[PDB]
Structures are given as C-alpha cells and as structure tokens.
CSV table of C-alpha atoms in Angstrom, one decimal:
chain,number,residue,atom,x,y,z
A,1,UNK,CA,19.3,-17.2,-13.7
A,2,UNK,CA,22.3,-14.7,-12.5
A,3,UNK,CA,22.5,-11.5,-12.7
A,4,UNK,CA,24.3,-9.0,-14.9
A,5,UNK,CA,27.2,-8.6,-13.3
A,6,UNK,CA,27.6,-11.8,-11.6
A,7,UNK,CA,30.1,-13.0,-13.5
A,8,UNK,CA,32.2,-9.3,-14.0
B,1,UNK,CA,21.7,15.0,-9.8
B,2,UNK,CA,19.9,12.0,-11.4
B,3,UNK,CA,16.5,12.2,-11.8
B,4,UNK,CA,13.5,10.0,-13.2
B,5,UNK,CA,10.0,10.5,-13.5
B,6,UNK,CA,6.9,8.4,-14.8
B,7,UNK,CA,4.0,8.9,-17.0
B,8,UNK,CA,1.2,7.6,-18.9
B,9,UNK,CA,-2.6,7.4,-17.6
B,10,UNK,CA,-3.8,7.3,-14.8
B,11,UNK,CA,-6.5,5.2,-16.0
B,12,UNK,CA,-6.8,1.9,-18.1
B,13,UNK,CA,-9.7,-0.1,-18.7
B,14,UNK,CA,-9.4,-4.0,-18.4
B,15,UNK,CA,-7.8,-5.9,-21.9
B,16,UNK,CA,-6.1,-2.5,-22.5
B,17,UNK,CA,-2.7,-2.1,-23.3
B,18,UNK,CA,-1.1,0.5,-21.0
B,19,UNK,CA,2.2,2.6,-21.5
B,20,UNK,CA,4.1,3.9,-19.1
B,21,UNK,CA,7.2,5.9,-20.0
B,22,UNK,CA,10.4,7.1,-17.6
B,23,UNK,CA,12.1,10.3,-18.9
B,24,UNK,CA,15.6,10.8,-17.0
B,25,UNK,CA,18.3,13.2,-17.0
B,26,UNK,CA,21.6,13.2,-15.2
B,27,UNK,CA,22.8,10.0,-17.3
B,28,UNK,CA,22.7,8.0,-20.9
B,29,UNK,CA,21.3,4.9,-21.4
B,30,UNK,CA,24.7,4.5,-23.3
B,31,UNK,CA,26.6,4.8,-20.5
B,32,UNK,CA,28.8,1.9,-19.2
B,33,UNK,CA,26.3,-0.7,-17.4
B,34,UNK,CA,23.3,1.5,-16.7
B,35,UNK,CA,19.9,0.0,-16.0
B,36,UNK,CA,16.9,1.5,-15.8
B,37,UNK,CA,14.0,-0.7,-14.0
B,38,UNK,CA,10.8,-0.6,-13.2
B,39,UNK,CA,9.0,-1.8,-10.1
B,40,UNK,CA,4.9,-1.4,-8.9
B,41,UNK,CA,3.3,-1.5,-5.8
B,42,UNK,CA,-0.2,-1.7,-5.6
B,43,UNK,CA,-1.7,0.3,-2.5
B,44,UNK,CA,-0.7,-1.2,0.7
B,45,UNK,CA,1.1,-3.7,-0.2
B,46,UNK,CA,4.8,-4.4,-1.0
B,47,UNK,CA,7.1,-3.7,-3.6
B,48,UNK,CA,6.5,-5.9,-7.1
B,49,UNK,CA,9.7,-6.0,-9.4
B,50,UNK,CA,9.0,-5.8,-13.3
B,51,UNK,CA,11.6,-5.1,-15.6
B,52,UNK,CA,15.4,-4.2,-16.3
B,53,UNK,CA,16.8,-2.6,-19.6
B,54,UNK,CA,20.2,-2.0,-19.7
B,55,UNK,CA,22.7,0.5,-21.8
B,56,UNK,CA,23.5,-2.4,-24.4
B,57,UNK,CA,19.9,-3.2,-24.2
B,58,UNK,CA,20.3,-6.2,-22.4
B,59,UNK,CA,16.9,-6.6,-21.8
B,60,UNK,CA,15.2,-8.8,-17.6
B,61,UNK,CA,11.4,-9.4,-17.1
B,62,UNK,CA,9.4,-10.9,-14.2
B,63,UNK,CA,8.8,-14.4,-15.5
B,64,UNK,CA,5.3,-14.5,-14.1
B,65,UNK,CA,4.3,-11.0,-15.9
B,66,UNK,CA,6.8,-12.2,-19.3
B,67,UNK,CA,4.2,-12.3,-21.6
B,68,UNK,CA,2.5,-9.2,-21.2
B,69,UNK,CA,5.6,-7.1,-21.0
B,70,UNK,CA,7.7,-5.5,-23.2
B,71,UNK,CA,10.5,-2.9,-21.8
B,72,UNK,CA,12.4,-0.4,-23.9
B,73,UNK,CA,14.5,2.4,-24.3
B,74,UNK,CA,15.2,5.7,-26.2
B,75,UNK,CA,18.7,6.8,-26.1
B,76,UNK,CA,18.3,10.1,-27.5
B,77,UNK,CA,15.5,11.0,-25.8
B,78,UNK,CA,16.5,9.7,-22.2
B,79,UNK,CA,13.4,7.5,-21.6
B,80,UNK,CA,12.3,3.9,-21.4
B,81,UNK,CA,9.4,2.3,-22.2
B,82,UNK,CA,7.1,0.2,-20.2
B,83,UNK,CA,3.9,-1.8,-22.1
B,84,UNK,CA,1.7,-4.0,-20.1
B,85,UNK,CA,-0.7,-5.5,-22.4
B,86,UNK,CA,-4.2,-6.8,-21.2
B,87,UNK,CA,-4.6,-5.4,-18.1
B,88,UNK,CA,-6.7,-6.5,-15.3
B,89,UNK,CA,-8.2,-4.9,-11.5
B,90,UNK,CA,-5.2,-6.4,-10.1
B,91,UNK,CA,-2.6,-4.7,-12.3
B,92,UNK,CA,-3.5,-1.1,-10.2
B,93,UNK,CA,-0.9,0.0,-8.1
B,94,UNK,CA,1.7,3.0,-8.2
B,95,UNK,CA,4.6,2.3,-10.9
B,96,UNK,CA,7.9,3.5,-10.6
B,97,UNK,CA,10.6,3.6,-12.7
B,98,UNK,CA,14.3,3.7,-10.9
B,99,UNK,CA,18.1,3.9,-11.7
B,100,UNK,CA,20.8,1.8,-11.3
B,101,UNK,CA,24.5,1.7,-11.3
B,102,UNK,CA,26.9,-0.2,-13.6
B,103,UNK,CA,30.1,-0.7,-12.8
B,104,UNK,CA,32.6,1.8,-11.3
B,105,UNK,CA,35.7,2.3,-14.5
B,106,UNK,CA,39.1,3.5,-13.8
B,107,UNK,CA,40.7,4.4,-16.8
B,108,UNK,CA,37.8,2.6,-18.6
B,109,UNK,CA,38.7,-0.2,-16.6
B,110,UNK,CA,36.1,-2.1,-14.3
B,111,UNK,CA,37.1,-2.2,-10.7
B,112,UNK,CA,34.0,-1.9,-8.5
B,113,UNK,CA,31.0,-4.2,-9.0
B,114,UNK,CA,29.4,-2.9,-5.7
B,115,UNK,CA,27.5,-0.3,-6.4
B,116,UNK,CA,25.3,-1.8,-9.1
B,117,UNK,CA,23.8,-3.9,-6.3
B,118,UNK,CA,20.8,-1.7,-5.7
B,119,UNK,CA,18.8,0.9,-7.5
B,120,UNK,CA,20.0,4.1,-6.3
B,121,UNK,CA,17.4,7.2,-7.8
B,122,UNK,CA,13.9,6.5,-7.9
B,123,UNK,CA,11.4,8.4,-10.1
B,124,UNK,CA,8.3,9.8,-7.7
B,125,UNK,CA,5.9,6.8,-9.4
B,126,UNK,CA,2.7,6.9,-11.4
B,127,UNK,CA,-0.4,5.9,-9.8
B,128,UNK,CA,-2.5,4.2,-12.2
B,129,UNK,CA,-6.0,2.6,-12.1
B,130,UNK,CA,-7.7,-0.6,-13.9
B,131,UNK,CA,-11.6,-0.1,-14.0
B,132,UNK,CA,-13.7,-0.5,-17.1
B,133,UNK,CA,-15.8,2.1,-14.6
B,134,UNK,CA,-17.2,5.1,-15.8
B,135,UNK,CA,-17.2,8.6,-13.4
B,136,UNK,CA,-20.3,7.6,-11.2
B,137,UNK,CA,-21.2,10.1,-8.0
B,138,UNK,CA,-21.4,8.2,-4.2
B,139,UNK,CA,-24.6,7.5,-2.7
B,140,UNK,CA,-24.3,8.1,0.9
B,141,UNK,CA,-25.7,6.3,3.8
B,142,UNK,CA,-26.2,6.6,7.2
B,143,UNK,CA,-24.2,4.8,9.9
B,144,UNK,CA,-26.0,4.9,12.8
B,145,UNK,CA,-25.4,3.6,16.1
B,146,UNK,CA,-18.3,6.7,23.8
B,147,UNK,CA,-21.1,6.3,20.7
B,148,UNK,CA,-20.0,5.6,16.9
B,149,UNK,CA,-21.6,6.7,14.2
B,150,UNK,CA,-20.8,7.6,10.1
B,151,UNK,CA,-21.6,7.9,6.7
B,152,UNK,CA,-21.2,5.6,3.9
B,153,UNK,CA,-20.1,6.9,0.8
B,154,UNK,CA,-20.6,4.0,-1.9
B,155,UNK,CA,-20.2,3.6,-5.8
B,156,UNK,CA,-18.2,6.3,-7.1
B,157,UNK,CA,-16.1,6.4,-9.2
B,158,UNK,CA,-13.2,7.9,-9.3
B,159,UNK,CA,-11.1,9.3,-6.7
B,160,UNK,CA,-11.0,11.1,-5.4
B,161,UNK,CA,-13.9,12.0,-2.9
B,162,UNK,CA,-13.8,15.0,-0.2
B,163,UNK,CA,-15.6,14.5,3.5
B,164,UNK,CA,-15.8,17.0,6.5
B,165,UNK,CA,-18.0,16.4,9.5
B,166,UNK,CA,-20.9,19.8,10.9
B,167,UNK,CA,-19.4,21.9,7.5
B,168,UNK,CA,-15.8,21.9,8.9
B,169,UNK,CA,-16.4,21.9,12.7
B,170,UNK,CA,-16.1,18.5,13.5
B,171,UNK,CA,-12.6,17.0,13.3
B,172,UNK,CA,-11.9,15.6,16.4
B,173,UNK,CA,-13.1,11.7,16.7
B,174,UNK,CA,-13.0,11.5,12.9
B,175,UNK,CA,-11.7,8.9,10.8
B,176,UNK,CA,-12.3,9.0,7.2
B,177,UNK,CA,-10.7,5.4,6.0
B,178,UNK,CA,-9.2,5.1,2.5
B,179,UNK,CA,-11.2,3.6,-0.3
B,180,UNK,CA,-11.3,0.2,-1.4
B,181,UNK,CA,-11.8,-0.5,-4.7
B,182,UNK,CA,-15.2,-3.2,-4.9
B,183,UNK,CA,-14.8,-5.8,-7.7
B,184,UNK,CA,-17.4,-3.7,-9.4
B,185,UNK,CA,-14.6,-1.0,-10.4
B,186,UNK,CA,-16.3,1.5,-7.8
B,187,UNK,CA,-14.7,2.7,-5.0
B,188,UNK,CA,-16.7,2.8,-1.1
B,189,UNK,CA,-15.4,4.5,1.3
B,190,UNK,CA,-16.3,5.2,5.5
B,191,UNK,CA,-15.9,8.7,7.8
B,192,UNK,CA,-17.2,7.9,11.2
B,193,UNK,CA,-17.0,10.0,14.2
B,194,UNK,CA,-17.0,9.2,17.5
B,195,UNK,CA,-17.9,11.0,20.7
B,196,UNK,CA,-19.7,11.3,23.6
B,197,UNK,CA,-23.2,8.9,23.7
B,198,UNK,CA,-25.2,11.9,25.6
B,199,UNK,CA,-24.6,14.5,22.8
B,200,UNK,CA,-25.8,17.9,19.3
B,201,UNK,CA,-25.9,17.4,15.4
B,202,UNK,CA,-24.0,15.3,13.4
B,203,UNK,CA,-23.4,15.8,9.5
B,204,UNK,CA,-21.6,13.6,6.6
B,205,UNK,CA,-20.2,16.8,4.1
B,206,UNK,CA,-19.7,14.7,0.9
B,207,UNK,CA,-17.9,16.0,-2.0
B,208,UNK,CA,-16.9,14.0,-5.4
B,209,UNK,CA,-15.4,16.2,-7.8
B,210,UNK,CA,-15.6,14.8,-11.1
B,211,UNK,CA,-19.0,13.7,-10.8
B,212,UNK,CA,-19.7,16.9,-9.5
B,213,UNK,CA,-22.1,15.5,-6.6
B,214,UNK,CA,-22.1,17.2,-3.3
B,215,UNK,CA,-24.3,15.9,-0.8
B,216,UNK,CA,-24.7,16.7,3.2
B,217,UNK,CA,-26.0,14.0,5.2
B,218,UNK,CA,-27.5,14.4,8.6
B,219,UNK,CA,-27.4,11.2,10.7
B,220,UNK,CA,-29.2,10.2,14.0
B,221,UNK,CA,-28.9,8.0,16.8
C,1,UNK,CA,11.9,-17.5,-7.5
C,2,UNK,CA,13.8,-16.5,-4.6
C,3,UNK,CA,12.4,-16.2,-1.1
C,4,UNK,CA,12.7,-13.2,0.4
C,5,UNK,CA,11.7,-12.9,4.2
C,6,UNK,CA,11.6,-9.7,6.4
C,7,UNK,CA,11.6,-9.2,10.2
C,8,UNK,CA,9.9,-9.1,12.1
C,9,UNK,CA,7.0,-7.7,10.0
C,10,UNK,CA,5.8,-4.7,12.1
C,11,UNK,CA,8.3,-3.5,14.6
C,12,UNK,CA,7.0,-0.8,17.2
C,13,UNK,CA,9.7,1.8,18.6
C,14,UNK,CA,10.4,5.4,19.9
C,15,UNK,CA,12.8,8.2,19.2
C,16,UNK,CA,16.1,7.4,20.6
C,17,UNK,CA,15.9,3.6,19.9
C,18,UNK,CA,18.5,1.1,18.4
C,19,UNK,CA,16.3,-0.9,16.2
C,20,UNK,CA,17.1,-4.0,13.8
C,21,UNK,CA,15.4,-5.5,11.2
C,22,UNK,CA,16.5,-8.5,9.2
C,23,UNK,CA,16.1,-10.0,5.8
C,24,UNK,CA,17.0,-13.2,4.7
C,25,UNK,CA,17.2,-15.3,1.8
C,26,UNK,CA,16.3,-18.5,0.5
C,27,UNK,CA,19.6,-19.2,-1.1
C,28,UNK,CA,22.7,-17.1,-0.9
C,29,UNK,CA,22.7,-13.6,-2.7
C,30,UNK,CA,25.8,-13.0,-1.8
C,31,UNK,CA,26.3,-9.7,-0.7
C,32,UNK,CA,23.7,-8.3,-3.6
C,33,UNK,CA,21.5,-7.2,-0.9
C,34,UNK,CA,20.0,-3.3,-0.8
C,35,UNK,CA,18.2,-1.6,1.7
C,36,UNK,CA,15.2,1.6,1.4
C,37,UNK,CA,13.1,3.1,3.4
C,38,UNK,CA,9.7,4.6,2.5
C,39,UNK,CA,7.7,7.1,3.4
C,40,UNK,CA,4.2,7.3,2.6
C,41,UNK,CA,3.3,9.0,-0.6
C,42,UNK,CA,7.0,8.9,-1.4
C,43,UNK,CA,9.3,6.7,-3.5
C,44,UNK,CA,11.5,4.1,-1.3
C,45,UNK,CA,14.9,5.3,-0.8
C,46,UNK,CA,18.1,3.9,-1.1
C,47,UNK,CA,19.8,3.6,2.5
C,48,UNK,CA,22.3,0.6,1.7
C,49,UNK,CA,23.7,-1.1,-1.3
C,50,UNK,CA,25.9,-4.5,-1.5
C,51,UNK,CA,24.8,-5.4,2.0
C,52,UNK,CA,27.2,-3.1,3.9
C,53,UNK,CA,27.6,0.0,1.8
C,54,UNK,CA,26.4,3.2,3.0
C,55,UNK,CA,24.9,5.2,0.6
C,56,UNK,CA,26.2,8.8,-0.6
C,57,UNK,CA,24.1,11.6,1.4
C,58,UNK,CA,22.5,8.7,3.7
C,59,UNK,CA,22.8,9.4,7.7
C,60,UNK,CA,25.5,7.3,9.4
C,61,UNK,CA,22.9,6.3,12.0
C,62,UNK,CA,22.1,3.6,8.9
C,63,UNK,CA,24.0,0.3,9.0
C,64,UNK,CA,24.1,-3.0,7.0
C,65,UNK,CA,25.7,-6.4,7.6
C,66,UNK,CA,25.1,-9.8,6.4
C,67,UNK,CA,26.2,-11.9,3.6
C,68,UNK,CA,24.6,-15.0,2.0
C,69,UNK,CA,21.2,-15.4,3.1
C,70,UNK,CA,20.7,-13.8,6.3
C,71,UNK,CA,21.1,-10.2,6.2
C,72,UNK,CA,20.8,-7.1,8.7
C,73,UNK,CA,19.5,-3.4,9.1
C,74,UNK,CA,20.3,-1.1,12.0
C,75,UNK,CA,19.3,2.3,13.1
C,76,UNK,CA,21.5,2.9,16.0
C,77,UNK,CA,18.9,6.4,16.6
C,78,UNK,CA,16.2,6.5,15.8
C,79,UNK,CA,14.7,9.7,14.2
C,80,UNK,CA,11.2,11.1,13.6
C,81,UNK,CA,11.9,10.5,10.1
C,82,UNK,CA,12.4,6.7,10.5
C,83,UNK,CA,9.0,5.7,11.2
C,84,UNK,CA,8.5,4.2,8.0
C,85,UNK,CA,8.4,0.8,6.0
C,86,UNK,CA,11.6,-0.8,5.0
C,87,UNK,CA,12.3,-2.8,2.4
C,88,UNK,CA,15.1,-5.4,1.0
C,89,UNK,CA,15.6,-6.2,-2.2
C,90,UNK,CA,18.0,-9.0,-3.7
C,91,UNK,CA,20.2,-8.3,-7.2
C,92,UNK,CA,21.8,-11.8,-7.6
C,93,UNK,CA,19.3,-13.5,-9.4
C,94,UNK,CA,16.7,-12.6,-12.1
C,95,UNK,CA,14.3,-11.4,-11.2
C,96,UNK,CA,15.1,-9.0,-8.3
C,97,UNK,CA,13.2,-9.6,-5.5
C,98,UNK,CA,11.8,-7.2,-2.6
C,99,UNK,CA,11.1,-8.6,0.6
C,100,UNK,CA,7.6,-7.8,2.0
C,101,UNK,CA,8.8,-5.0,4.3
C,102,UNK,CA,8.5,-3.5,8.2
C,103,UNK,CA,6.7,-1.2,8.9
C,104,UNK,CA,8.5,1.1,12.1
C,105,UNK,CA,5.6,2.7,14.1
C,106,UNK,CA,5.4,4.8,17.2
C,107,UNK,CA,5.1,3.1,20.3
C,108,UNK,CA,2.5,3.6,23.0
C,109,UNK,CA,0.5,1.5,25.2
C,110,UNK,CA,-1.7,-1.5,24.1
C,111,UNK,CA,-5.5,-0.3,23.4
C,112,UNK,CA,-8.3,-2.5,22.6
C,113,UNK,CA,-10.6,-1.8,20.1
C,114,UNK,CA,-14.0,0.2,20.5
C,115,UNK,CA,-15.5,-2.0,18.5
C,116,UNK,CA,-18.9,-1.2,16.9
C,117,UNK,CA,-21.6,-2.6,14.1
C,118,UNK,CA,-23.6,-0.7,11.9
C,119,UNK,CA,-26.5,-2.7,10.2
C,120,UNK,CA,-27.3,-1.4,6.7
C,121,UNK,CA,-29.8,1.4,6.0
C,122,UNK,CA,-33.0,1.0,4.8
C,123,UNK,CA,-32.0,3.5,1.8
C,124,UNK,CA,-29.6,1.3,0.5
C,125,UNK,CA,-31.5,-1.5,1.0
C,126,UNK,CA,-34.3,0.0,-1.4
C,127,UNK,CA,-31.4,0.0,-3.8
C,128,UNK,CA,-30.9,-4.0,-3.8
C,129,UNK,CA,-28.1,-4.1,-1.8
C,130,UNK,CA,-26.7,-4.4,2.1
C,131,UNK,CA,-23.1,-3.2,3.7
C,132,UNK,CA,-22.7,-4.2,7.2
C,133,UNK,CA,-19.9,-2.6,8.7
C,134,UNK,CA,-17.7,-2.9,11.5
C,135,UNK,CA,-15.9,-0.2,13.0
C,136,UNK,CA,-12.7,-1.1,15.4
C,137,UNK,CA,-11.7,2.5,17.2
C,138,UNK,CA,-8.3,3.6,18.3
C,139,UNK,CA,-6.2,0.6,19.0
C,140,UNK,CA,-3.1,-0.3,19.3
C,141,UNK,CA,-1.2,-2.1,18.5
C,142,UNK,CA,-1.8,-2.3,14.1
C,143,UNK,CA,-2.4,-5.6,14.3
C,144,UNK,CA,-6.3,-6.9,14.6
C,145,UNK,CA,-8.8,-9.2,12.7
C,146,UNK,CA,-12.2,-8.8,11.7
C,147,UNK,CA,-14.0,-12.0,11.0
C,148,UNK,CA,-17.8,-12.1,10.2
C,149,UNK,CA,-20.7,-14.5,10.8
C,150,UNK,CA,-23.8,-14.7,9.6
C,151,UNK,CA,-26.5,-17.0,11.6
C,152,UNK,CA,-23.2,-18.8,12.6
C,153,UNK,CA,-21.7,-18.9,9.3
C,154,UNK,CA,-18.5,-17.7,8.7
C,155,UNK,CA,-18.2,-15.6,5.8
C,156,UNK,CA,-14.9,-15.8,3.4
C,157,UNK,CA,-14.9,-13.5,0.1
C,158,UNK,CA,-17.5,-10.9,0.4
C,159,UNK,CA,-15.4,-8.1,3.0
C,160,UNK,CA,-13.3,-5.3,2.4
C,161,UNK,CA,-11.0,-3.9,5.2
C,162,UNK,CA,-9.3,-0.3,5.5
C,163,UNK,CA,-7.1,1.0,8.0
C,164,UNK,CA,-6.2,4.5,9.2
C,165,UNK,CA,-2.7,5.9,8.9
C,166,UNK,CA,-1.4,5.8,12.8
C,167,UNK,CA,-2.9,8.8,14.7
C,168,UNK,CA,-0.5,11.5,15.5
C,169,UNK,CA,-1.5,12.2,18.9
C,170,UNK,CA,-2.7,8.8,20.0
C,171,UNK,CA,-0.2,6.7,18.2
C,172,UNK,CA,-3.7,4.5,17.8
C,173,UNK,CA,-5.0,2.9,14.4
C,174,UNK,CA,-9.0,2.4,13.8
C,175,UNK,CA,-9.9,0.2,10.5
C,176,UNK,CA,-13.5,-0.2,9.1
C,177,UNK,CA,-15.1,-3.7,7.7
C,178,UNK,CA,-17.7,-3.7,5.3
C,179,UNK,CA,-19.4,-6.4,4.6
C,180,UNK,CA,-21.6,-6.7,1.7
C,181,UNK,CA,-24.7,-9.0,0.2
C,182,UNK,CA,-27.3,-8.5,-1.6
C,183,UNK,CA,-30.9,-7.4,-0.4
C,184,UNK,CA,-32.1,-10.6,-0.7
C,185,UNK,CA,-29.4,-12.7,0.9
C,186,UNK,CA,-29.4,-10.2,3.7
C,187,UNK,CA,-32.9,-11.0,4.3
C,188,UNK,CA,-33.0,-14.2,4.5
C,189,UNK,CA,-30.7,-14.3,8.3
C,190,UNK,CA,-31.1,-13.0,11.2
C,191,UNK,CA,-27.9,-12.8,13.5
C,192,UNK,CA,-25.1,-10.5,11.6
C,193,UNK,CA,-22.1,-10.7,14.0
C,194,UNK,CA,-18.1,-9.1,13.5
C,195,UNK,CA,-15.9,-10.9,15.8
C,196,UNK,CA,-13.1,-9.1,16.4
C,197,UNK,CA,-9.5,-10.4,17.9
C,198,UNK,CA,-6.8,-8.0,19.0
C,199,UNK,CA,-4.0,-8.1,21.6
C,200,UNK,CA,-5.4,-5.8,24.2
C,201,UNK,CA,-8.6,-8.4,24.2
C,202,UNK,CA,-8.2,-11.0,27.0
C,203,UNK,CA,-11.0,-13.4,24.7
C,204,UNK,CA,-12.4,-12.2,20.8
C,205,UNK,CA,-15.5,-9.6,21.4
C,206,UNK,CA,-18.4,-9.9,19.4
C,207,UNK,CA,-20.6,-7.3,18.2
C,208,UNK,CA,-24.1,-8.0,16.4
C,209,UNK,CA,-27.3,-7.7,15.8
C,210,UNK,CA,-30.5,-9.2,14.7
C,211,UNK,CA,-32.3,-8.1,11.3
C,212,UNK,CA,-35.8,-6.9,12.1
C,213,UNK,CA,-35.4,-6.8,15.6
C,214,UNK,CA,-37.1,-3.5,16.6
C-alpha cells in the first residue's frame, strides 16, 4: 500500500 | 523549534495494556499534512516502525503489530496517543515518538512533496520494560579464574544496578557488561577485571538501589 | 513488507576518512529514502531526506544519492562525532521501513580475544542453579562468536551474550557469555567448553573445563 503523499 | 517528548511507564507487566503519550509543541496536528509517528527499538537492535497519525487523522499501523495498536491524537492538547494492548518480554525496547513534514504550500498551494519523505524531530524516547517481575536484590557470585576474574550479579530486578572494583580503586581492566534480561524477567549482569596473574585484593562493590541490597564481594584465585 | 538492506553492516574508519554506506531496496521507493544517524543514548537524527536533500542545520560533509532501490550515504570527513549507527528508512510504502543499520567505529589493529571460562560457583550451585561464563577480552574487531559445548554437545537456546561499548583508549570491545542450566543438568557432564571464533584467530580457541576435576 502507498504512501500519503504518493499520489499528491 | 519543534519539539516532542514521550511518556508513560517505564514498566508494564505481560497482558497489560500500555500507554504511551507524545506531547509536542512548535506545530498543530491541524496543520496541512502533519504526521506524527511512532517508532521502538528494543536495546541493541534496530529501529522498529509502528504507527502514523496524520492532521486529518488519517490514521497507518505496522500490519504485524495491527491488532494490538491503536494511535491517536489530541489537537488541543498537542499530543498523540499510543496503546499497545497485551504486551509481552519482547515488546521492551525504548519508544519514540517523531515528527514529520506535510507538504510545503505556497499561497495554500502544494508545491514541494519532498520534505515529507523523512521524519525530521525526534522526541528523546521512553524506555519501557515488560516483566511480570517484582523488585528482587542480586545474588552475587564469584568469577574466579594476564588473569581474569569477576563477579556475577544475578536476579535482580530492576535496573538499575551499581558496581566498582577495591571501593573505587580499581578501574583500570574493568568491564562491567550491560544486563540481559533472563526469560525469568530478572536481569544478570558481569564486571570482570583483568590484570596481572602474579598479583593484591580483589573486590566486587555491588549496589542495587531499589532493592536496597549492597553487597562487597571478595574473590580469589 | 519491503526489504530493506544496509551496507556493509559494521564499517570501521578514522577521523579524516571518506566513508560510504549504502541502502537498498527490494522494490523501487523512489526517492522516499531518509537518512539518521544515532548516537548512543540519543534519538536518531535526521541527516537526509528524499534521497538527496540535505537537511536544515545538518553539516555539508553529509551527502545522499540514489533513487529506486539502491541508495547511498557519504561522509566526505569524517568527525569524532560520526562514530555512530546509521540508519535508512523508506516512506513509499506502508509501513515505513528502517534498514538494520552500520554501526561506524574507530579503527585500530586486529586483536584476538583473551578468552577465558569461569565454571559456576558452588554458592550458586547450592541455590539449584549453574552460569558458566565466557569472557572474550579486548578484541577487535566487534565481530566474534561464542558457541558452547557440553560433553560435545552443542548447545542452542540456553546463552545470553553482552558486549561492551568500544573502549576509548584501546578502540577494543570485550563481550561476556553466560551460559545457564540447572544444578542438576550441570551435574550430569563433565567437559563444559566455549569455543570462540574471531578474525585475529588463525583456527577457533577453545576454552574448558572438566566438572569435579580438582
């Protein structure tokens, strides 16, 4: 699972 | 400055529920992307993550402790919460609680995703014990036989535990080991001097504190 | 989870050294990737953050590089202060992981062990129980291994190790074996041996005894 701000 | 600090006992007995609790100042668990995290290390050995809470309480755990953790936070009182239910032996190490970043914001825009890619302030961490032991004095043996020789200082309970070689005098060829904790919740320990085989009196100054047992141990060849 | 690997594990140097320690990754982390170091009794600190970031207040003498799974530490200097345990820790993935960390001692010359045995005292045996210990003196380097027989049987499960912190003036390490059985068990062998391997031992040296023997 990714982390938080992974995606940002 | 950002700082953090842990607390909650130092001691826990085995299928107790232990909280730990990391007050910090210098930030808001309501600002932008904040974390606050938790991380153990049980003596000599490596870092152990546990837990992330974040500002919109976005809440991480370490799938192989998940079911015995629960993380969370205070906004108004700057602190997050750490419970660890049933503990065991293995659970003692030093626990630390630590910052970390969120995003940088220009003009409450996100433009920097960088700096959240560590935890940057670390609280000094909370040393904690799991023993179902009770406050037990050593018993202290003899270690006899360049020639080596030492005193044992077994079963006590807890630490710490004070030795000095001939009342102060001795201190060069010493080595007074760190504790291990025995599977029976009681620590043992070793001080053993070394020196020259054709030597003079040697003595084991033993002090435990909060058994209050202070012992001197003369030990021959 | 994610893998995790430091190296080497120990890494032995001296003021004035470039030294370089690497971490890498079972599968990329891109370049959420941070580096502390940690002194004893202390909290690690934060030295480098997203793999190449130095680190507000942190000494230039610090560098990071690396991206995707293989990922690298430098102290151009090195500093009193550096002789520590470093550590990596990876923020792409749930959960964070922390590599297993080097440990950055003082060099010196390779020392065997004084190695010595200490067969339990007849106080403690009049308790019910036995501690055999093995004492390996000033030796260098950290690195050593303490394995126990009894009447040729290996033992597994019933020692406890310790290890001194390095020494200040002899750069050497000592660490103390205890081995422990009951009275009874004790009594019934004869030959208690600690076999001890290090780097400055051309062959294993064997220290032992024989219970009763007097």
């Amino acid at each position: 699972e990714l982390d938080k701000w992974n995606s940002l | 400055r950002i700082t953090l600090k842990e607390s909650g006992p130092p001691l826990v007995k085995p299928t107790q529920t232990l909280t730990l609790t990391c007050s910090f100042s210098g930030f808001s668990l309501s600002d932008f992307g904040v974390g606050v995290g938790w991380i153990r290390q049980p003596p000599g050995k490596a870092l152990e993550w546990l837990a992330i809470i974040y500002s919109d309480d976005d809440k991480r755990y370490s799938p192989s402790l998940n079911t015995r953790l629960t993380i969370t936070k205070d906004t108004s009182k700057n602190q997050v919460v750490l419970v660890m239910t049933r503990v065991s032996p293995v659970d003692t190490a030093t626990y630390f609680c630590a910052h970390r970043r969120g995003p940088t914001t220009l003009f409450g825009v996100p433009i920097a995703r960088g700096p959240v890619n560590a935890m940057d302030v670390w609280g000094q961490g909370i040393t904690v014990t799991i023993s179902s032991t009770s406050t037990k004095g050593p018993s202290v043996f003899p270690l006899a036989p360049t020639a080596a020789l030492g005193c044992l200082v077994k079963d006590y309970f807890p630490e710490p535990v004070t030795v000095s070689w001939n009342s102060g005098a001795l201190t060069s060829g010493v080595h007074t080991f760190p504790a291990v904790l025995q599977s029976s919740g009681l620590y043992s320990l070793s001080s053993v001097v070394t020196v020259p085989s054709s030597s003079q009196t040697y003595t084991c100054n033993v002090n435990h504190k909060p058994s209050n047992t202070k012992v001197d141990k003369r030990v021959e060849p | 989870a994610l893998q995790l690997t430091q190296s080497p594990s120990s890494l032995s140097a001296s003021v004035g050294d470039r030294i370089t320690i690497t971490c890498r990754a079972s599968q990329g982390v891109t370049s959420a990737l941070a580096w502390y170091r940690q002194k004893p009794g202390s909290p690690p600190q934060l030295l480098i953050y997203d793999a190449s970031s130095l680190e507000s207040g942190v000494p230039s003498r610090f560098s990071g590089s690396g991206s995707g799974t293989e990922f690298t530490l430098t102290i151009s200097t090195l500093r009193p202060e550096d002789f520590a345990t470093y550590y990596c820790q990876q923020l792409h993935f749930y959960p964070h992981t922390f590599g297993g960390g080097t440990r950055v001692d003082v060099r010196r010359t390779v020392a065997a062990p004084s190695v010595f045995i200490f067969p339990p005292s007849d106080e403690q045996l009049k308790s019910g129980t036995a501690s055999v210990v093995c004492l390996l003196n000033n030796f260098y380097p950290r690195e050593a291994k303490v394995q126990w027989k009894v009447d040729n049987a290996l033992q597994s499960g019933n020692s406890q190790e310790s290890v001194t912190e390095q020494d200040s003036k002899d750069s050497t390490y000592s660490l103390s074996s205890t081995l422990t059985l009951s009275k009874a068990d004790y009594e019934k062998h004869k030959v208690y041996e600690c076999e001890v391997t290090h780097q400055g031992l051309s062959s294993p040296v064997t220290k032992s005894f024989n219970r009763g023997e007097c």
